[PDB]
Design a protein around this ligand. Structure first.
Ligand SMILES: Cc1nnc2n1-c1ccc(Cl)cc1C(c1ccccc1)=NC2
Length: 127
């Protein structure tokens, strides 16, 4: 069995910014989710080999995880907040696509996503 390469977290020719919204996404949104008791399955790419999920990357073609997001934020990979918001949403959606309602991992994603939504509700106006 084989995992795909992870999502990129470095691309020197991609234009980059550090906006106040991006800073909030790191200091508030990412930090809040990362410390949560349910963060651990989301803190790195899905290891389909170790988890014995050989169909995961047959079904999930746009993988995303908070490890990747954390690196992207810390390494100023993004141009805007929407890019990062999309990554979080891709992570949650993938979980729901792959798994079944009421599965433990879905309950975990839902708890994290509730917090995500509460924090992005107060994304600051771009300064
Ligand atoms: C994210 C994600 N999306 N689907 C899966 N995951 C996981 C990723 C990493 C780990 Cl260690 C477990 C799971 C688990 C998992 C299952 C029950 C409780 C905790 C994690 N399920 C497969």
């Amino acid at each position: 069995s084989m995992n795909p390469p992870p999502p990129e977290t470095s691309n020197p020719n991609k234009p980059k910014r550090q906006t106040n919204q991006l800073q909030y996404l790191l200091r508030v949104v990412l930090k809040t989710l990362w410390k949560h008791q349910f963060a651990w399955p989301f803190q790195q790419p899905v290891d389909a080999v170790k988890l014995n999920l050989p169909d995961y990357y047959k079904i999930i073609k746009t993988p995303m995880d908070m490890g990747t997001i954390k690196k992207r934020l810390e390494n100023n990979y993004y141009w805007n907040a929407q890019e990062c918001i999309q990554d979080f949403n891709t992570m949650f959606t993938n979980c729901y696509i792959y798994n079944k309602p009421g599965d433990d991992i879905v309950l975990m994603a839902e708890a994290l996503e509730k917090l995500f939504l509460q924090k992005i509700n107060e994304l600051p106006t771009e300064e």
